[PDB]
Design a protein around this ligand. Sequence first.
Ligand SMILES: Cc1cc(S(=O)(=O)c2c([N+](=O)[O-])cc(C(F)(F)F)cc2[N+](=O)[O-])c(Cl)cc1Cl
Ligand SMILES: Cc1cc(S(=O)(=O)c2c([N+](=O)[O-])cc(C(F)(F)F)cc2[N+](=O)[O-])c(Cl)cc1Cl
Lengths: 306, 306
Amino acid sequence: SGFRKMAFPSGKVEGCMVQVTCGTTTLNGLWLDDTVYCPRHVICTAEDMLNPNYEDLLIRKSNHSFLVQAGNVQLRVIGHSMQNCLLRLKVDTSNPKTPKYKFVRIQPGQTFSVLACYNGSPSGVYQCAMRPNHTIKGSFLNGSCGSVGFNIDYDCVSFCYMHHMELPTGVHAGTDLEGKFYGPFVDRQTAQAAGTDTTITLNVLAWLYAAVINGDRWFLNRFTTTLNDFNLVAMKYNYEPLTQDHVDILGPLSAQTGIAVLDMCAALKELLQNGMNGRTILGSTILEDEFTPFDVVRQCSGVTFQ
Amino acid sequence: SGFRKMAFPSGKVEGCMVQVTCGTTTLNGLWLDDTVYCPRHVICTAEDMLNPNYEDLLIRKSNHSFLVQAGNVQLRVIGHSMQNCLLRLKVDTSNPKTPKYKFVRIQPGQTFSVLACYNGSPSGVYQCAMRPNHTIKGSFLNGSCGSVGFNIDYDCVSFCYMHHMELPTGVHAGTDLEGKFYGPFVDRQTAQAAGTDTTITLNVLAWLYAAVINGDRWFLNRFTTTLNDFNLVAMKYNYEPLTQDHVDILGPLSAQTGIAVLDMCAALKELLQNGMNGRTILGSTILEDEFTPFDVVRQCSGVTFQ
Ligand SMILES: Cc1cc(S(=O)(=O)c2c([N+](=O)[O-])cc(C(F)(F)F)cc2[N+](=O)[O-])c(Cl)cc1Cl
Ligand SMILES: Cc1cc(S(=O)(=O)c2c([N+](=O)[O-])cc(C(F)(F)F)cc2[N+](=O)[O-])c(Cl)cc1Cl
C-alpha cells in the first residue's frame, strides 16, 4: 500500500553523464556509445545569448574547442555536428556503461524521471509530468542544463528530455534527444513565456482509480454522465476535455475496480463542483494530475482492496 | 527554481541488491563486500509467522539452505548468523560494485531515499521521512521487504533503513542495518499498530525558509513570538514542540533570508490559526513536513530571490 511519486532507478543514466566545457561555459552531456549529446548553448559567450547564430558560432570551433570529462577521465573529441538545438560530439572512446536505449518524443500528459546533474555529477532524481503547455515543473539551478529525462522499460532506457532553460514563471523547458524543443520555445534570450496550462484530466481519473485500488471509495456517487456533459464542467474548471480515446485507455483500471469510466467521471464532476470537504485522497487534499494510467498500473497492486 | 521531493541517485545501491530465497520465501538482500544482509523473516514458513522462534528456526538451517542470486549469478553462502532482526550471510564472492558506505541509525524527522525492489530487482526510488511515530509512509507491495533506505554523502552511501512490514494503516516499518527496529515493532504477526503521529515542526519551518529563498514572502507577518507561546499553539495543532536546539539548527537558513527564527514561528502560528486562505506555498496547499533543513540547503539556491 501507499502511493508516492516514484522515479525510475537512475543508475543506468548516471553512468552516461559527462561534463562538457567550451570556453568559459560548462554544462552536462549524455555519453552513449561514442557520442556525447549536449545543448548547443554551450558554444555561446556571455554576450552571445540575445541573438546567437549557432551555425556561425559553431563553424568557428574545432574538435579541440570542446573539453569532455567523464569522471576524472578526459575524452577526446574527434568530430562534431549540430542537430537542431543539440550538439553531437564524437569521441574516441565508446561508453562501456552504455545501457540498452532509445530516444523517444513524449506526449503532453506523460511522465518521466529527471536526473538532475551539475558539472556532470548526478545530484538528485524526481518524477515530472510534461504539462499540456509543454513545460515541466522541475527543480533546477544554474548549471543543470543537459540533465536528461527518461523512462525505463525492462533494461531499456527511453530518453525523452534534455534540459535547456528556465522560463520567467520558474518552470522549465527543453528538447527531445533529437534537439527539437517541446513547445514553442527557443534557445535564446527572448520574451518567451509559458502559455496557459490546464489540468490533465486523464491523469486525475487514473489517480482516482488508484485510490479505489488502494481501498478508498468515499468520493464515488450514484450518478453517471455523458462525455459531453462532463466536458461542459471540465472547461469550467480548466480541465482537459475528455475524449473517447481517454475513456478507452482507462479500460483496464475500470475492469480491475468494477467502476465504469463515465461513473468515475461523475465522481470527478462532483469533486470539482463540491470540493473535497476537508477530506484527502491518497494522502492528498487536492486532485493530483501527474500520474498516468501507466503509472498507476506500474505502482499499484493488481488486486484491489474491496 | 522549483522545489520537489528529490531522491538521491540510486545507482550505487542498485549494484548492491540481490535476491534471497529460503524454502518458499523470496525477498531482497543487500550485498556489501562478502556479506548479504536481509530480514530474518525469510526463514519463516506460512505457519511460522504468529510466534516464530528465530533462534530455533535458524539452527535448523545450513549454509545451503539459502539461495542468493545476484542478477543471473548464484552466490554461494559459506556462513550465516543472526544480528537482531537481520540475517548476515557470508558469500564466497565479494561484491565488485560495493560503494564506499556506512550504516547509520537515523532520527525521527530525518529523511532518506528508498529504493523499492522486488525479487532483487530495483523498481523505483522515492524520498521518505522517518515519522515521529517511527513509521514511514512508503509505497510497497508484497515482496518488497529487504528494500533499503539511504542517504548519499559525496561518494559514501549511508544505509539507514531496511524494510520489514506493513502496519494496519498501510504505513511501513523496518530496521536499521544492525537489525534493530525503528519504533516498538516486532517481526511477527501481532496486533501492533502505529502510535499517534505528529507534524514535524522543524521541517515545516525549513520549508517556509525554502519558499522565501525561492522568492515567496506572502505568509510572513509583523509579529514575533516566544518559544513558549509558540509551543502552546503547537500542541493545539498536533505539532512537535519547538526547542532551542531546533532554533539553533535553523540558523543558516535564518541568515540567508534575513528572517529571525522566532519571526518565522510567528508566521507559522498565523498559518496554523488562519489557514492558507486559498493560497499555495511552493505549489502546496498544505504545510509540508517532509523536508529537513539539510534538504532545503541541498536543493535550494544559496542566493535568495529578494
Ligand atoms: C540552453 C541553455 C540556456 C541557458 S540560459 O541563458 O540560462 C536561458 C535561455 N537559453 O536557453 O539561452 C533561455 C531563456 C528564456 F528565454 F527561455 F527564458 C532563459 C534562460 N535563462 O534561464 O537565463 C543556459 Cl544558461 C544554459 C543552457 Cl544549456
Ligand atoms: C519481515 C517480513 C514480514 C512479512 S509479513 O508477514 O508480511 C508481516 C509482518 N512480519 O514482519 O512478519 C508483521 C506485520 C505486523 F504485525 F507488523 F503488522 C505484518 C506483516 N504483514 O504485512 O503481513 C513479510 Cl511477509 C516479509 C518480511 Cl521480510
